[PDB]
Design a protein around this nucleic acid. Structure first.
Lengths: 54, 72, 122, 92, 50
RNA sequence: AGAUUUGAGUAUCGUAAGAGGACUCCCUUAACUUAAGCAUAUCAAUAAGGGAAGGAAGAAAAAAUAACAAUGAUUUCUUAAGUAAUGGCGAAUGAAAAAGAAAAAGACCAAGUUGAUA
RNA sequence: UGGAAGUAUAAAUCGAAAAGGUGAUAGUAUUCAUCAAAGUCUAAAUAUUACAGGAAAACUGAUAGCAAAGAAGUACUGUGAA
RNA sequence: GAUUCACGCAGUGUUAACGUGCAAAUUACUUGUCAUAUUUGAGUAUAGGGGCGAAAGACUCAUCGAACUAUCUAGUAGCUGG
RNA sequence: AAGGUUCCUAAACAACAUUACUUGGAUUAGGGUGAAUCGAUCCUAAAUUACAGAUGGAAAUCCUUAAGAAA
RNA sequence: AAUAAAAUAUUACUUUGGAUAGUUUAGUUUCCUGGGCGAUGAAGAACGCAAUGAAUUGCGAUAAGUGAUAGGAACAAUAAAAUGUGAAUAUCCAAAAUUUGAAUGCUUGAAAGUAUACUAAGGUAUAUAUGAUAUUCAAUAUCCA
């Protein structure tokens, strides 16, 4: 899917928070919030260069 | 006192349940619904809110009559 | 479900009414029994009775509507409930006659110069 | 070699793939057969002139044109009103 | 509040009605996975926000 | 008083609204980005905003090409072609006739004429 | 706009015709060629990642594949958009 | 728009307590103030190159020398890490 | 105001109230809110929003009795 | 100099954990056919309905279902009743279809309501703009006795 793994509004928290700079899911209230984001190596994110039907 | 202490007086609702969409998004003072865009005749939908489209649209409900017609 | 379509159909209109009050009254007393600790046989009777009322009301309404269609079959101003079943788009479309309408010039030319039947020898 | 590649715009929305090509043959061939069964004279692809190509690069070649002029029908003794009914193309 | 609109009170009553567990007989059905109602709430745990 | 003109109220029979918008026709003067800076340019009819449609829509019958041993409505595909041209002539942008196919279809108003006029 | 002494649209002003437009280097003249604007309609060949129904696959096989293989846009968070 | 005490309120000092706290700013004593430029409830109005400010770039939902949220957007990185 | 069944009773203590609990605002099942006179409903305040009209490329904005054969 | 309590190392068994292997009623992509909503009230929302239901599913005061036509002997967690004189099950059909929603008599905040007319209670119609026809009017606007 073209939008697979890119369906979040995540932004990196930046430095100064003792965590890596990989983007993080926004909001709160669930376990998903504050987790990894679109990045290739993250869970539930897009993979390396996605396979295209063309 | 911008943190714990200031939250003591939060006892006045800003939004109440809307009548067209059923969500607690009817602004009392603004007299409009922030979610479904009440009295505005058209349902409030934005292309930047692609997820908000897939949460309430055709086929997300009962489809009481349309299901008969399309099958017809 | 014990009322039988055959029994309902034979009954007259007043009998259908008088049977409906009896069934509604019979149902009302069965609701009291269930609340007041009724027997399972009574409770199963309550479910059965509810179907007769639905069964009885269908036949009265269906016969009344069918009689109305016979009235308005020749009527010029048919009520919208008795009009043929279509969609909103279908009603607005031009009639098949209107679509196939042609002017006298174009209709008369097509009469004198139709599409002939032929083939090429090879 | 100096590269001139026009991919700065969003080509991904400009990409057209031909996965329907093997099914255009089946569609067009079947429709082409269906017309023949309906009125076989219709699919005859009505007769067309023999006109030269334009420009001096092609002017020695002949190709089918569209429609016979009203003078060519008169020369061949065919009515222009009846010509269209018997599979002749007419181009006034 | 002691004072409420009629429609609001009925929506309160439904939330009370929906705060119930699975009946025992439904739990004995063959191939049954619905043992507990995960939509349950209590007044002091989660505010229903209405 | 009567003959007209214009504008309203009411009654009857209908009509528009809202949903959807993947594809279709449009309105509007975004920026990030590239130019190893940047201000024209690029990104770019692109994002967001707004309107209108159908099973397809748009276009369509020359005030069109060409300079030929000439073609001939529209649409779509191949080629022309990263070419002519545009551009702080920098970065970059960029067609069309000819030619080869799919399909093929042409008809109307206005103006003019006939007025024991309809 | 590729259209370069203006390819297209719009606005302000001006504004034709015993017709005239075009031949993309502005200008005047004489020939030549080719069309006849300022109203309307028109099937077929073409597009489609809405949605519905089907069939396939050198696709993934529960941290993978749609966010969702269970009452998933559900539990839960926010006044709210989300 | 005098001096003080009280119900209350603030936050001068201890630069006391606590500082993985009772608390994402609180506690104890001391201090000041405690009705007319007073304190306070509900309703209502003002919105982001905007509002509001007895003015500190202060406040605008623990976010303000330009809020929150989503799209452009996987923005660019001659720089760091793998 | 806000909360929403936390109210009352009975059975019961696996989890929860930084030990424990026979207790509980915790689990399970029932019961419980009675108006001509109290309030909402009625009136208007700050303010708010319509048809028509005016403005705008558009979404929409202005106007609240002024512009209207309206009110 | 001595101890092996702790410490360390190997293997077997058990434990906390859920990797690995086997598997799929789920997804992704392409393609074919359609692209069939609404004032005859849609999409969406809300409330209600099962003998024991909280969600979910289906449905609308005829309620997890009614009639008709096919269909031929079941359902089940536990009882009941019905059932070859027709149980399940299926549907572009018939009747029926609560409060709302473009929402359209007026009002609507979480609002309870309410006006007139036609046929006490019930049910219908009455929003805005607009085309045709009918009828009643307004303006010396043009003539005009």
């Amino acid at each position: 899917s073209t939008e697979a793994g890119k369906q979040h509004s995540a932004i990196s928290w930046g430095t100064g928070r003792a965590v890596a700079r990989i983007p993080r899911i926004s909001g709160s209230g669930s376990g998903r919030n504050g987790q990894g984001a679109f990045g290739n190596m993250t869970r539930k994110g897009h993979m390396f260069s996605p396979l295209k039907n063309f | 006192t911008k943190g714990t202490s200031c939250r003591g007086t939060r006892h006045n609702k800003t939004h109440i349940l809307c009548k067209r969409c059923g969500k607690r998004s009817w602004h009392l003072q603004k007299q409009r619904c922030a979610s479904c865009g009440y009295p505005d005749a058209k349902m409030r939908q934005y292309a930047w809110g692609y997820k908000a489209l897939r949460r309430r649209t055709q086929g997300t409900g009962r489809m009481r009559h349309l299901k008969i017609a399309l099958k017809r | 479900a014990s009322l039988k379509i055959s029994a309902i159909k034979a009954m007259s209109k007043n009998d259908m009414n008088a049977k409906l009050i009896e069934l509604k009254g019979e149902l009302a007393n069965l609701r009291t029994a269930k609340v007041t600790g009724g027997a399972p046989s009574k409770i199963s009777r309550l479910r059965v009775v509810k179907k007769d009322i639905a069964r009885l009301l269908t036949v009265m309404n269906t016969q009344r509507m069918e009689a109305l269609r016979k009235y308005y079959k020749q009527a010029k101003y048919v009520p919208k409930e008795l009009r043929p079943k279509t969609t909103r788009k279908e009603r607005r479309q031009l009639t098949k006659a209107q679509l196939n309408l042609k002017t006298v010039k174009a209709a008369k030319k097509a009469q004198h110069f139709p599409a002939r039947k032929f083939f090429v020898l090879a | 070699a100096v590269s001139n590649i026009h991919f700065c715009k969003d080509w991904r929305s400009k990409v057209h793939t031909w996965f329907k090509q093997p099914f255009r043959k089946i569609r067009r061939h079947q429709t082409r057969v269906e017309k023949a069964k309906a009125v076989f004279p219709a699919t005859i692809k009505s007769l067309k002139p023999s006109v030269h190509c334009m420009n001096q690069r092609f002017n020695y070649k002949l190709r089918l044109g569209r429609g016979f002029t009203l003078k060519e029908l008169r020369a061949a003794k065919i009515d222009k009103n009846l010509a269209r009914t018997i599979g002749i193309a007419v181009d006034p | 509040t002691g004072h409420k609109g009629f429609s609001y009170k009925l929506k309160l009553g439904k939330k009370i009605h929906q705060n119930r567990g699975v009946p025992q007989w439904f739990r004995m059905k063959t191939g049954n996975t619905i043992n507990y109602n995960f939509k349950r709430r209590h007044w002091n745990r989660r505010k229903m926000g209405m």
